[model samples]
Target chain A: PPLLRCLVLTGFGGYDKVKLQSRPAAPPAPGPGQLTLRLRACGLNFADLMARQGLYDRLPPLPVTPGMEGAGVVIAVGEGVSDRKAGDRVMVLNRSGMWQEEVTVPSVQTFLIPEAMTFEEAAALLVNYITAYMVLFDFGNLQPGHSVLVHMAAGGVGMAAVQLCRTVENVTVFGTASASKHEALKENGVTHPIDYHTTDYVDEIKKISPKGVDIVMDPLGGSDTAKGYNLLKPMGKVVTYGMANLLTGPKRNLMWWNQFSVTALQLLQANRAVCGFHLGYLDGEVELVSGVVARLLALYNQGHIKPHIDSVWPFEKVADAMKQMQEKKNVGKVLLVPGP
Target chain B: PPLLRCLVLTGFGGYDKVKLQSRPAAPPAPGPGQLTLRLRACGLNFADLMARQGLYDRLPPLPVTPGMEGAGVVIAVGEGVSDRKAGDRVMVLNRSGMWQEEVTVPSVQTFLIPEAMTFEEAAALLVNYITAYMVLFDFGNLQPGHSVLVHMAAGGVGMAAVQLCRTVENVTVFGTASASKHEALKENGVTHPIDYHTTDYVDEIKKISPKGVDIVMDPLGGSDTAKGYNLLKPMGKVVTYGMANLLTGPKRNLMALARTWWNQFSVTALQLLQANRAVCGFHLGYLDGEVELVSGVVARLLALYNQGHIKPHIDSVWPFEKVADAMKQMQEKKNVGKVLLVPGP
Candidate 1:
């Protein structure tokens, strides 16, 4: 077996916990129904940040690989894998363990990249766009002329949501980002960009649409989740997908636990709802997720959506990449590539 | 104005709190966009029982009439009303105060009952079937071959849900009820009827379908609500429409409050995401302003009724003077289907 360089979070804590180490790569031939890939681009997400700090609920035990998605070329194919073969270019989706130079995954998790798509684009599309699609259409029941409020609008999922919102007609997107990123957000199809740091999003949203929005894509949880619920018209819904509030530190703090109260009575009385969508917990729903992925691929081929890459870093500079996302310096997806 | 006989919950306490009182009827003429209904039959629901005991959340102040839906003839029409006129038989869907002999309401709240449908059947249909449809198709996203667990399977909404389940092919219905009503539930399309008094419904459900159900129509809140969530497979949903645990008493007692508020029924966003399950709160009473939405759902339901896919199973009919008895039938859980009240001759 050959040793491959990979970044591993040996334990949960600060940057010091992350170490670049050489580990055994997959066997020359993958197991049955599996394929080995030479990963070229690994996508970093907010869940990786939370998992590094032990803040994510679904995080495995310490010392696990952290990348969620990537794109690479097939290096080997196991027996019974007829559709894919060695040297085929493919994008891979998995729950974890994609942060390495080489990986072996079930053939179902890999999809052929479009002819014109770049490795960085395939690496950025799946996790963000699939989540955005589920929150926007499947759960949110988005319709024409409906208004949406997207938190963390400059992040990967937020940008994906803004683009998908444009696919529907007359969708008004109200995004929350820093003043510095307002132009970039607007360029990405954010109709209204409010600087969340300088003003309250609730007040800003109310000032524009007094009746409130139809859908709120809430990645920030805690009190922000309740505010999302409040910023809805009748029959409106808030789809919560992340817990960014608790990702501030390595430990869960009282501030993260501090939340506003919502009652079932209120939901029924006002005809509003609060929904939860987590792509991580949907491991058993691979078949359904694959169907959605197929639709997303068709959309990509049809020129309805594209992925935005913020910056790329080498495997040795993984800590810097995490810090860029932590400090909110990145406008879209941040990726890591393994170097010789 | 004429003095009209109606049932009123003078205050929330016990059955005595409800009285047969005379209220001022609508004037000979109505205002703009309104219609006057000479209510022939009124529908009684568990909400009326809970409202009489102050357990319901959306009940208006006391001394108010206590009916949610009724059917009658359109005796008068207000200005600007073009679609409806005198002598049109219609079913009235309202928030409350529909127990009176006559009511003045917005024309939007009235739907013309199907020609062959009787006043009793029209009065029985809207509240139960519309609520059932919203919970099943709208929120639950029910599809073919999906399994459902209906709590209180012999009650009005439960029966309506069972009939709707049959409308979708291959739906397996696991219903909970008393042993006495098991036969009726099975005949009404409940695939499995488990007597809740003698057996734990959770264990009984797992016995047949180890994978668990896909949708649970949970009317009984409190501990049962938690059990409903447990009985769901991944991507399953529980639509809670009522609070029967607190309805056991006339006043909200400490235990009743604890059973509901202290139960693990209130789910956080993290919990729902982790489980891949959904908890939805549905209230037909609050949807009164959604005229077009409710109208469309009612139209679909009427088509189903017309096609013989579903029918209102009336349990018993009581005259207006026997309003208390009508409520008692629903309160004691004796009624297998809708309990209705007819105008006394």
Candidate 2:
């Protein structure tokens, strides 16, 4: 039982350089309030690539296992852990060390997945899908019939937003992506797909909805962010969860953070809002993640949502999976299974 | 009779410099859709002071009469004037030529005052008291029991606000004023009066109400305007009605307007708003003063549930023999009257 059989990045940039290492098996058992998980599958995310490239400010010290979400079986429970039992199929949420083969997590952060869903689907459920739920329900205060503009409609969170918006009836979803993915997004409940490569999304949205959009889910931060802010109707919100532009180029300067500040200011002027969503930072809270995960899993099991799997790679091929995600080649959740 | 004597401002400044002039009286007959008013009294406002000082950008050319609120008897009806008739005691609103003995105003801008109220009280009612009602009820969306921060608590609008807030049950008003005016504000329904002169009003408000205030009525612009933005609770509004500071100083320079712009930007940053209480401008149809004055008069008479002379000033000295009995009755009614009238002829 190896404690640390995982891939780790030493510095920023180029996921091809991520190295795998072996460490002593099972150094110590879980302490009070801890639970040991036998990792079955880990979800890949753009955040992992950003963290690997040192583009994320709040990344753990170098040589840290990077996964933030996964699904596994509870193999052992530590003292005082009463809510979970061995052999329970649970999803781990807001845990940074989910990339490893066998990881120790606090019992509070784990939720028993519905009996109908597969472990692979549960693994993809916690991070991106739950974040989509939180942003749509909790933060955005989305209601049925409200229209939303989701950027990067073919990406993981974008797909999740589409499902969430569809689950609530009467919603009109507008999404943006390269022209090639417009048809795929339309199949996933996106009523309007503006090809960012071929059209100006802000102008397209204005044409489609003269009253303006009710919410904008933006993860791409840059010059285009202001255009998204302009798309919001009075009292609408633009939630900025990722700065993908920062990782797409050379290491960014401090001015990128200043740009975010200015975007927030401009949104305020329009009686709209810009909120930063940091799932990694929410790692310390257990109840918060578990509640969100449970609600999301409920939505998934009821057929209200279906998690899209982009591609699955073996544990040894985690580095390749990271590279694929960094290149934005995937359509939805990218996964890494623990096998040869 | 000559057209009502109009005291028009020949140059910018104080009341003493207003040029009193008489012209041939208007024809007794009214024109189409116009009502001729035998004006009894005109309301004096801080805006009149501003107009006198040439601060109003849309004012008529020099030597224009500057009254905005008045009460009068309808002397004659013009063609198409169906809602009112001669002998009806009505309040003239939104008409700039109110500072005169007779005025011709469109029928839409006049309202019949309550039967029990005096002409002088109706005159003061239109501009200040009605504006106070609209801001608190329509714009602020204020609920009963909601606490409010009213700046310039002793001024015309502020006094009206204090009364309105008190008339609406469960509201608590915290007013800002000089220390000398605190007692007066407290006596006039303000539970807490923050002396802004010696203390930081924001800190004082936060100290008094850690939960923050629901609404702020501010007319003072410039750097001081930012202080109102800081004291608002989440979703609270800072409504700006007048630019008082613009009038009390030397002519505003580019630097001063720039300072005002920055202050406005600071408010925007807090997600607090700066809404203009442009009811006067709206009613007068000076420029989009399309809001009707009748609804305001209704709200005013309803708020007259409690009566008193809120703010009064002497305009002229009338010979005692001219109307001695009427003058004595006016003096006796001072506590309940919004305006004290004296004979001047």
Off by over 4 Å in 1: A1-3, A24-27, A57-60, A79-84, A112-115, A248-255, A260-263, B1-4, B22-27, B143-146, B165-172, B179-192, B207-211, B249-264, B303-310
Q: Score the docking of each candidate (DockQ).
A: 0.34, 0.06
lDDT of 1 at A43: 91
lDDT of 1 at A144: 84
lDDT of 1 by residue, B1-345 (tens): 557888888876766777787767546677899998899999998778877876666678877888899999999999999999999999998878888788889998999988999999999999999989988876677878789999999999999999999999999999999999999999999999999999999999999999689888877877787788789876677777887766665543222454335653677777776665667778876666768778989989999999999889899988777877887788778899999988664
**Candidate 1 docking quality: incorrect, acceptable, medium or high:** acceptable
Each candidate structure's count of clashing pairs: 0, 5
Root-mean-square deviation of candidate 1: 3.3
In candidate 1, the residue pairs with backbone N, CA or C atoms under 3 Å apart (3 or more residues apart, or in different chains) clash, namely none
For candidate 1, the per-residue lDDT at B40 reads: 92
For model 2, how does the per-residue alpha-carbon lDDT over B1-345 read when each residue is reduced to its tens digit? 535466666766544445556778756777898888887777656555556656455568777776677788999999988999889999877647776677888877788876767676677666667657655654455666678888877765677788778767788899988787687778888888888779988888888888567677766654554565566553354555655555454222222344324544232111111121111001122322434334644555545633642333222322213222322322222222233222134
